[PDB]
């Protein structure tokens, strides 16, 4: 089958398969731990690009930290090289293009190293000779380091030979120049991976706080003598329960926005559900379902629903 945990014996010849299998098992083990708490432990941590040289139909990545669904974490800041430049000459006829980070499939039958020989498929690994520091002492030695053969591909291309992850979307401006679409949201591993979603989340929290502070004034304005008797104060005190319960929970999630969106979705959906009790203009199923691959079909409509529910009263 897939992974063969090695048995270490005295008098055994050391083989690369022993170290490859042990490393593969450790990746699977870390992935199995992630799956205990999260349904989708994959996506973008960071996907940063060089917007300069875009007028010349060229897209370059500056920082890519992406986890693939097979448990492979790619990190250009720590372990991997940046992918080559993405040539946009082939999409001069297009108004929109979806950029994906592509990691070739691992072949269980070998030939994963791009050794310069011809192949019918892209190979996952590249070898780079690096003078690596021995950490106990002071010596350095040239070691073959594993570099993931990453490329920036487009979603309309044939990508079955790769594991892909949406990383940007390019749209044309008023002049017809390519620019990164601010509405784009990749599958998320962290909220911080999307600065536009961050801006929208900070706006929601401020809106919730503003609505909560106004609702504080109402209970106060029609004076409260610790003896509520008014029929209107009933819906007011109950709407306050929903906002007061959610606000500190939402705040700590947004103050350190480095966790998986499933955690945020759960709390946002809980708040939306609580606010729907007061509205007659919405369906029982109004809260958008969670779909990890397309966060654009979950977060913007959920934030839209929430902002509309907060503005109601």
């Amino acid at each position, epitope marked *: 089958m897939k992974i063969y945990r090695p048995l270490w014996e005295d008098g055994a010849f050391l083989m690369p398969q022993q170290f490859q299998q042990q490393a593969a098992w450790d990746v699977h083990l870390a992935d199995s731990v992630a799956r205990m708490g999260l349904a989708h432990p994959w996506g973008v941590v960071a996907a940063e690009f060089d917007d300069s040289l875009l007028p010349l139909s060229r897209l370059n990545a500056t920082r890519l930290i992406v986890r*693939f669904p*097979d448990g492979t974490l790619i990190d250009t800041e720590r372990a991997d090289n940046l992918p080559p430049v993405c040539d946009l000459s082939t999409v001069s006829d297009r108004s929109l293009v979806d950029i994906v980070l592509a990691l070739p499939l*691992l*072949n269980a039958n*070998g*030939g994963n190293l791009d050794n310069g020989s*011809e192949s019918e498929r892209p190979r996952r690994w590249k070898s780079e000779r690096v003078n690596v520091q021995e950490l106990a002492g002071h010596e350095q030695s040239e070691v073959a380091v594993l570099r993931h053969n990453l490329t920036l591909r487009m979603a309309h291309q*044939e990508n079955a*030979a790769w594991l892909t992850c949406p990383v940007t979307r390019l749209v044309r401006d008023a002049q017809g120049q390519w620019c990164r679409d601010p509405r784009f949201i990749p599958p998320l591993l962290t909220l911080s991976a999307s600065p536009s979603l961050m801006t929208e989340l900070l706006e929601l929290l401020h809106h919730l706080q503003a609505r909560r502070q106004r609702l504080m004034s109402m209970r106060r304005e029609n004076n409260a003598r610790l003896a509520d008797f008014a029929v209107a104060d009933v819906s007011l005190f109950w709407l306050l329960n929903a906002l007061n319960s959610a606000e500190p929970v939402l705040k700590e999630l947004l103050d350190m926005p480095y966790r998986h969106p499933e955690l945020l979705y759960r709390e946002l959906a809980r708040l939306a559900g609580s606010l729907l009790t007061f509205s007659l203009e919405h369906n029982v199923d109004a809260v958008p379902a969670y779909h990890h691959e397309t966060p654009e079909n979950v977060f913007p409509p959920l934030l839209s629903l929430l902002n509309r529910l907060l503005e109601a009263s």
Partner: nanobody
Framework: QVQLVESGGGLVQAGGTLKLSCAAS????????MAWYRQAPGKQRELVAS???????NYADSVKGRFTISKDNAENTLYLRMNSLKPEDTAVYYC?????????????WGQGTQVTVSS
């Protein structure tokens, strides 16, 4: 699993023609790319031509401009039309399927067919 059987091999003269066939069966829906490989006597196995499921063709530099790879999806048959044949094309030709299942790639091979080009 994917099963492959090659046919069409044999003896031809230089500048001659041959059409190799490969019948594919099993879990054909997971096939990403199909290829032709060859192993000349005393030489390492080498890629000849490849075709993605979508129909994108690629040829090794040594056979580019001479060979044609094609796929009949209604019959699940891979073809290799070999033209302008040379003695250096003498080898055992192998059919290959690169298959995908749950984020992992797998190789399936045929038994091979002998191609001999006399000068």
């Amino acid at each position: 699993q994917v099963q492959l059987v090659e046919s069409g091999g044999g003896l031809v003269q230089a500048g001659g023609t041959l059409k190799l066939s490969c019948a594919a069966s099993g879990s054909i829906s997971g096939i990403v790319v199909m290829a032709w490989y060859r192993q000349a006597p005393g030489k390492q196995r080498e890629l000849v031509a490849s075709i993605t499921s979508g129909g994108t063709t690629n040829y090794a530099d040594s056979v580019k401009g001479r060979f044609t790879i094609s796929k009949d999806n209604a019959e699940n048959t891979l073809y290799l039309r070999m033209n302008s044949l040379k003695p250096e094309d003498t080898a055992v030709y192998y059919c290959k399927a690169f298959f995908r299942r749950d984020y992992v790639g797998y190789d399936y091979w045929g038994q091979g067919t002998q191609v001999t080009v006399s000068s």
